């Protein structure tokens, strides 16, 4: 009953010793000679209006033109960013949706929330109307985030401490991940799609193998709950956001925190994070009603996107990097470029 | 100027906007309430009486009330509670009979009232199980002083309005509990949101009327704030 606890403590100490032994140089010191990016200025190119309630999540399509937004008023709206037009308006059975996803092929959209069900909507029906293809049930907690692997496989994270891989044509959890301690909030698919990393409220981030199904790597550098996570474009690193007003960069091949992005004047929480196309700039949403752009190499703030009067909940960058969308609880989505 | 496809897309967007405005108007005439409390509080009985995530719909004075009982999540309420940042009011049910379980109820009320995401949301407090509390007080077995070392130095305020027929001890205990809850409520908030204590006997049919009145008052205060009148 107690020997295993001592063994676990010894293993953790050994892991810490291994991590510190291979920490000869720090990322900030190496990037000292790199010239600063400067002061990036972004303007609200497009403003999207129509949602009757606070926005909780959004996701860009692979075409970098169509994006899907989820609001607590029960409407899932697909927007045309270039022309500011609403392609579809999907009614939701549950108005407590808190996540949404856009399929890579653009044929399907998924969303869910406190209903503990991830509902997949078909956007290319025969007669033309958007209809539910299948709704995925089995989670014992609110749906926190979901991301499509393809038209048939979608990875799911729920407040029940577990993440699952689903087969849309079948509706059963192909693989279940149960390594977290509580309330896994967000997950990010790697560019290769063979791995994904999720953040939870236990101030830890765990790397998962989609096919093997077991946890390969864990990260513990935060002090509060983690609610934002995004994969670095290279795929060998990721950034996480928490309520400590700090964003931290973790590398899979190093098992260590490269740097911490924080400032004294920032004490509010962090809601969403996302990298640019090249990963040079890290954009993180905050509860101070504004988003600030960080430098992934020198950990220096570059600009502030102050265009929302309410909490910023979601933020996403287009695949081509042309523009970044920011969502807020004021029921407005703004496109920055 | 524009093409046929562009015109069709614009017309579809206009139709979607019209439908969204219609849906928003339909939802505007409905009040959303969050129901939460301990297991022994008695939420199920109250909602069953009102109607005679789990959703209960009841209409008072031709006004739709939509009450939500999450009652489908782990014991941690840290995150999903944020989804109700824009509810009309929060209905909190406390079993005043259980003195052992009262301290945890007070702690829960403190957490709810002081939440950063619930600062602008008023709370409707129902002290359920009043007959059980009254019989427990008129028993001589369990003393509130044992659990709370302040009931001894407490007297019933002259502003109390007891029902016709009641012993001084029962009303004194009820108003001591109300004083504790009101002191917790007024410890923070700066008057932005108000607590509406009430007595529920687990059989009263006036709970819906009291909720209706509390919602009317909350909406009045919100409109006064919007118009800069208060």
């Amino acid at each position, epitope marked *: 009953l107690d020997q295993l606890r001592q063994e676990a403590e010894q293993l953790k100490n050994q892991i810490r010793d291994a991590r510190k032994a291979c920490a000869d140089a720090t990322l900030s010191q190496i990037t000292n000679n790199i010239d600063p990016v400067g002061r990036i200025q972004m303007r609200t190119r497009r403003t999207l209006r129509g949602h009757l309630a606070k926005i909780y999540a959004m996701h860009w399509g692979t075409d970098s033109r169509l994006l899907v937004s989820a609001s607590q008023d029960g409407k899932l709206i697909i927007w045309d960013s270039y022309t500011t037009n609403k392609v579809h308006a999907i009614p939701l059975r549950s108005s407590w949706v808190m996540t949404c996803a856009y399929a890579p092929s653009g044929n399907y959209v998924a969303c869910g929330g406190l209903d503990n069900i991830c509902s997949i909507y078909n956007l290319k029906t025969r007669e033309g109307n958007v209809r539910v293809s299948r709704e995925l049930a089995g989670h014992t907690g609110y749906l926190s985030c979901c991301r499509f692997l393809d038209d048939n496989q979608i990875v799911t994270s729920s407040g029940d401490t577990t993440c699952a891989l689903w087969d849309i044509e079948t509706g059963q959890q192909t693989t279940t991940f149960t390594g977290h301690t509580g309330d896994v909030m967000s997950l990010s698919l790697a560019p290769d799609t063979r791995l994904f990393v999720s953040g939870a409220c236990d101030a830890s981030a765990k790397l998962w193998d989609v096919r093997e199904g077991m946890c390969r790597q864990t990260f513990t550098g935060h002090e509060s709950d983690i609610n934002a996570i995004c994969f670095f474009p290279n795929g060998n690193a990721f950034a996480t956001g928490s309520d400590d007003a700090t964003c931290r960069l973790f590398d899979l091949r190093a098992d260590q925190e490269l740097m911490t992005y924080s400032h004294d004047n920032i004490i509010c929480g962090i809601t969403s994070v996302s990298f640019s196309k090249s990963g040079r700039l890290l954009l993180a949403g905050y509860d101070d009603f504004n988003c600030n752009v960080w430098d992934a190499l020198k950990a220096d703030r570059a600009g502030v996107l102050a265009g929302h009067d309410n909490r910023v909940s979601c933020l996403g960058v287009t695949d081509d990097g042309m523009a970044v969308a920011t969502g807020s609880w004021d029921s407005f989505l703004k496109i920055w470029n | 100027t524009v093409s046929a496809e562009d015109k069709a897309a614009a017309e579809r967007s206009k139709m979607i906007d019209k439908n969204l405005r219609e849906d928003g108007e339909k939802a505007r005439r409905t009040l959303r309430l969050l129901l939460l409390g301990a297991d022994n509080s008695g939420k199920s009985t109250i909602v069953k009486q009102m109607r005679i995530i789990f959703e209960t719909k009841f209409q008072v004075d031709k006004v739709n009330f939509h009450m939500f009982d999450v009652g489908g999540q782990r014991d*941690e309420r840290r995150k999903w509670i944020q989804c109700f940042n824009d509810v009309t009011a929060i209905i909190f049910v406390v079993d005043s009979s259980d003195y052992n379980r009262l301290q945890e109820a007070l702690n829960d009320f403190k957490s709810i009232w002081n939440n950063r995401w619930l600062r602008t949301i008023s709370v409707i407090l129902f002290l359920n199980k009043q007959d059980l509390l009254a019989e427990k007080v008129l028993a001589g077995k369990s003393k509130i002083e044992d659990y709370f070392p302040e009931f001894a130095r407490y007297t019933t305020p002259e502003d109390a309005t007891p029902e016709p027929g009641e012993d001084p001890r029962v009303t004194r205990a009820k108003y001591f509990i109300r004083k504790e809850f009101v002191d917790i409520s007024t410890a923070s908030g700066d008057g932005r949101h108000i607590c509406y204590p009430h007595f529920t006997c687990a059989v009263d049919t006036e709970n819906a009327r009291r909720i209706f009145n509390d919602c009317k008052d909350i909406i009045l205060q919100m409109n006064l704030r919007e118009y800069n009148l208060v």
Partner: nanobody, 128 residues
Framework: QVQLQESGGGLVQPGGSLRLSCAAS????????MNWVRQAPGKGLEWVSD????????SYTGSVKGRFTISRDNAKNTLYLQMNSLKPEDTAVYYC?????????????????????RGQGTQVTVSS
């Protein structure tokens, strides 16, 4: 990693006094509100006392109000809880709990079955 360790406890005669301390690491102790959680055998978690960020606000539960003295030490990142005049019913496990977020007067996860920001706890037994 955020971890909490509780030092002290043991077997104490009724009416005696014992002093236990909680060790905090991996987070800014000053910026995080600290709480004490007790779990009597056969009963769920209950709240005992809490400590403000600067210690200005001090509160105790009704059961042990006026009996336990609690102090804070931000310099050493440790929490002190002085207990005297104990009773047999006080025999339980004291868990060192931390508020989920810093600079917040509200803490919902203080009493949770599977809370992550709590220590292993120490068993205290009061008997003759």
């Amino acid at each position: 990693q955020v971890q909490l360790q509780e030092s002290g406890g043991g077997l104490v005669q009724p009416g005696g006094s014992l002093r236990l301390s909680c060790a905090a690491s991996g987070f800014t102790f000053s910026n995080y509100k600290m709480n004490w959680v007790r779990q009597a055998p056969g009963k769920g978690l209950e709240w005992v006392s809490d400590i403000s960020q600067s210690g200005a606000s001090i509160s105790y539960t009704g059961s042990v109000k006026g009996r336990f003295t609690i102090s804070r030490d931000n310099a050493k990142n440790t929490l002190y809880l002085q207990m005297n005049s104990l009773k047999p019913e006080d025999t339980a496990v004291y868990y060192c709990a931390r508020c989920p977020a810093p600079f917040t007067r509200d803490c919902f996860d203080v009493t949770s079955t599977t809370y992550a920001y709590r220590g292993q706890g120490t068993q205290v037994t009061v008997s003759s």
